[PDB]
Amino acid sequence: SGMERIKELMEMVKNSRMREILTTTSVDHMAVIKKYTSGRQEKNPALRMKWMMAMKYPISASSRIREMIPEKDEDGNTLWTNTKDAGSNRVLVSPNAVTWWNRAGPVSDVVHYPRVYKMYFDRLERLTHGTFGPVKFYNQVKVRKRVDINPGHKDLTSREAQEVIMEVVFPNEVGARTLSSDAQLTITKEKKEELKNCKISPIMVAYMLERELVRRTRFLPIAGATSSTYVEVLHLTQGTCWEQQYTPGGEAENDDLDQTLIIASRNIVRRSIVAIDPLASLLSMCHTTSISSEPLVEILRSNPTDEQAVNICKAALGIRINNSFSFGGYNFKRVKGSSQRTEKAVLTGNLQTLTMTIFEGYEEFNVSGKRASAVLKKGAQRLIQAIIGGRTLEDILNLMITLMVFSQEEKMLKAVRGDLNFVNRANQRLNPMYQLLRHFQKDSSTLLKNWGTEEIDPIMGIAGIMPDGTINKTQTLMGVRLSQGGVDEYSFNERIRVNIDKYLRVRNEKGELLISPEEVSEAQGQEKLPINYNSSLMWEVNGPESILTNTYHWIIKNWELLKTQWMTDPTVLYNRIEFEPFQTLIPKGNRAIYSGFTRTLFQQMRDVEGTFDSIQIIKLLPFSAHPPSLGRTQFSSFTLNIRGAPLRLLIRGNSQVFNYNQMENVIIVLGKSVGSPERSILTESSSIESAVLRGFLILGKANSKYGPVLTIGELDKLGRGEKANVLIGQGDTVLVMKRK
Amino acid sequence: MENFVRTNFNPMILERAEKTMKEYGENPQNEGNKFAAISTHMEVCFMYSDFHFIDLEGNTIVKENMLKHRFEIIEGQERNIAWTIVNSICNMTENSKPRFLPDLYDYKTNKFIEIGVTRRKVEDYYYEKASKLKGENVYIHIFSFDGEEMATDDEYILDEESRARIKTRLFVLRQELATAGLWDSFRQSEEEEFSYPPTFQRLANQSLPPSFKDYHQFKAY
Amino acid sequence: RGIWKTNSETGAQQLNPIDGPLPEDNEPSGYAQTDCVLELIEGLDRSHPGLFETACQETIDAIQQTRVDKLTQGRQTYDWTLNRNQPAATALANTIEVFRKNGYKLNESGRLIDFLKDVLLSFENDSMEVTTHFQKKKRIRDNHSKKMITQRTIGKKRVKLTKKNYLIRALTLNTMTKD
Amino acid sequence: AKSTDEELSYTITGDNTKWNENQNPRIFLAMVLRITAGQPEWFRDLLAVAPIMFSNKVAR
Amino acid sequence: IGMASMLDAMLSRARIDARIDLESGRISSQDFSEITNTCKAIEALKRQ
RNA sequence: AGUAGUAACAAGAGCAAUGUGUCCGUCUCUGCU
RNA sequence: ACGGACACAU
């Protein structure tokens, strides 16, 4: 009842050394004296186990084995022996005693293993009922990123889950801190009701709860899906040259499917506009695309996902549009106006150079969901007017932080205090608009006194909010008011009817241009579930790193066919649909200026004989997959958007993107070998070149018998029969003549 | 003062006062009037609970010497010990857990008790204490050297004799602070440091670039 | 090519190459210039504004909440009370025992910074009194090989360190070969 | 990315000769004092102790 | 965590555990008195 | 002799740092088809 | 949280 431990403490206190230790050691010093060890350290346990298992008794167990396991086997083995001491509570045990217990010990009716290790049985249930597709062989472009190896609880973070575990298992030891969430409280009451009358040790209960509730992450090289059920089978699903198609056993997660529907929508939308019919291609790809081995159009008829590119895929089919987008989890529904996106290089509050994406153009908003409402008048970097509503008085105060992050003026971008790294510890680019969100939730005093005040007229139906938390009726902040009733429901939460056209601009029965394809967010996220665009319009796995390698891999094996199309009737070659998903990597204003340069380079390779570089026709060819312009400008590199970072591709020589390797006789793209082009080096390696400059011929290396040096942009005022020395790029000079 | 407190309070009161000051990181001789105020708080918290029992029938009695105490004393213990007591009580009587550590717990009325002792007026420190403790169902009780005491919502769970004895002891202590003169400093008294000792100061002076003779001269440079 | 001085506290010969003569070849040199180091740290602060202050604030928050038993996280630690390596928790327990035997009881609060204040205050102690492991040898006969061997029996013993000996042991790094 | 196209780029695969023997605790003292500039002086004195102790160390 | 000694922590925990067990009816009054007197004997030794 | 290699073993006290990352756990015998 | 193993640098 608790009498035995106080009698034992009396017995120990009657010893003098024990009493001095128990009276002089504090609870903090007990952590030090608990790990006190005065013997020699045991090293090398592998070697020690190798030779200790040759002995008869390598195992030390408690003395109760003398009552549970006999001293003699049926075969005559000795199972345990008493130690060299006399009153030791410890015996030396043979592994034959372990085998005796496993074959002839007491059978128990109560086993605890499927409950304590329920996580691993969940894993085995996911594997056993899983399905295997084929194996495809291609160059896997893995990217090292942080993923979840244990998903944890959705309502908890790791520290909140550890505090829930302490409140459940050891409730009288939690100390000063309380549980600061209602989710913590519901999980705590549920786990306390679940774990009543448990004869398991509390530490094993705590570790079982940590396997259930605590989210663990690791940096792993992932090629495909990144949800926690595709990460446990990462050794099975991917390798260096192969992909095993695997669907785990069981029902998928909802928030995982909601995310990967958006990523698959944006790929099909961005692929479609560089087709000659952007609607007929989007319908051809939506009906064949599958997510976690489930078709797309059956997901697009039951999902409440409110996103811009999802709405193109539904308005093409016929599913009704719930027109809104989501920042922070709230429905940010537009009303009126129109904008367009184009990024820029702006400065932030912590003196860091940031590449933000700001929506330039007027947009009227009705932002409302589940706790409040807001009618945000807003244009270009200007929170003009927001009559914000609510239900409780405090829930308006947190949503006040929500709208003022989305505003992005020249006030909130320079009213940031603290340390807000938009990169991570691996120099990985975090998206900026959600980093100001999680920062201003608790640091809000810089967003209330830098925002200032604006004068208003005493009209009824309007309240106010001050910087210092005062509800007011004379003054308030700039562009933010407070209403009472707000805007009612069943107009944001109605899925309205719309119609689509050939170029995917989505307009309703009145004619509101609700979605244009130019308003699609051109980001490449990594999906939680795999996506099989089983179509002849895409490649095997999408991704900007994969579109680069697979396009050049296809030109290299089809080079015997494509070189003949290049030699005669070349405009049939440029119009290939294999070349079309490569154009999603080029920015929009750069497409016609690159094909006009490239085809002008390609025509000078034809009118000048002997200047046939098959390694440079390959490199420039998927930049001609567009109707050209007549803009006679000079380029030394072509930029390519991959994960936000514009990779350059040099017209002359290797790069980090297109590297030809003379040693292996191969073209290396992004570190992936994409095959030997033709192996025609002896016909190649010429002197005169024609596909580097526009209207100019490189004539060998540098020579100063013609005058000074120029650069690539300063060749505009030249004449006939005039040669020069030009910095061509990558630290070298060539003799260059503007021809006839 | 110092010897006043050591001649006026019991050895257990001064022992818990010295242990409290050490736990909060301050010697009793550096802060003497704070030591006297801590011994005052401890003595009032002990006179609130001494010889006050609950019998087997649940009726509170007062004794001189098979009984259990009415109050659990939380002031004086170490902070994690006091939080163990408070957490065990809040888990038995399923109430809300107080945000700050209280001073007593009453098993009869099932309530946490907070004790303030002031030299100033009772009502100003009472309103500042009820503002500091806004949000909890504690029972505040302010005593003064003046001879007035304030309860919470004018309700009393202690009897008349014990509260009169507390006010008698506080009046005697206040008059004892006057006759030795130390009521002027008493009634008008309401960071991390890391220095170098001299041997390490000379080691610091010998650890510089060769054109500096002093560690502080180099720190200024 | 640096300056030689005798330490006033330990009595040791100390070589100061800092702000020494600039090197004249490609040999390894220790003549670091203090102004150039300060210029580089100033440039690191200029390219990263608010970095040093954030890192110092995190270190200030971590100093106040670090216990003494963090020092038990180590592996084999030079134990100055034994003049030998011991495990880290054993070495810390011997140091705390010797300190509290000598009147340095700030580390009784359990914070690491009070232990560090005791470490700095113990250098003023004119005579440290530590417990040392001595041994008692005895010639016995081995019973399974019939060879006269030496029986070693380790006991504890109290000695008195001087101030300079304690200061030399407190600055002592024990060495061994990396295997 | 932070390069134009008329630029060579070379990478040194570098090590340093006798790294720990050519470092200096007095330089570490100057580094620690400049990093903690404008900080509380107890904190600057606490963080200076380890370079001062390594400037006066002996090796058993 | 803690600054009190191990013995004071153990005696405080034993007293509050016996009191909560007597409030919850999980021990008797004689067991409560015997636990509290064992704690007082340990404190009589700890004084010396 | 031999192992070995900048210093040892060839019996008669067995000397394991710091930092970072990843992974796992929670007290009289010798037989690898 | 603590421990063990392995890798790398010093």
Ligand SMILES: O=C(O)c1cn(CC2(n3ccc4cccnc43)CCCC2)cc(O)c1=O
């Ligand atoms: O410690 C408490 O819970 C508590 C502290 N006082 C303040 C005093 N005090 C006592 C210890 C202590 C430690 C830090 C700061 N003030 C402290 C007691 C008298 C003088 C100051 C007052 C109450 O009413 C309390 O309930």
Ligand SMILES: [Mg+2]
């Ligand atoms: Mg108190």
Ligand SMILES: [Mg+2]
């Ligand atoms: Mg009080």
Ligand SMILES: [Mg+2]
């Ligand atoms: Mg090196």
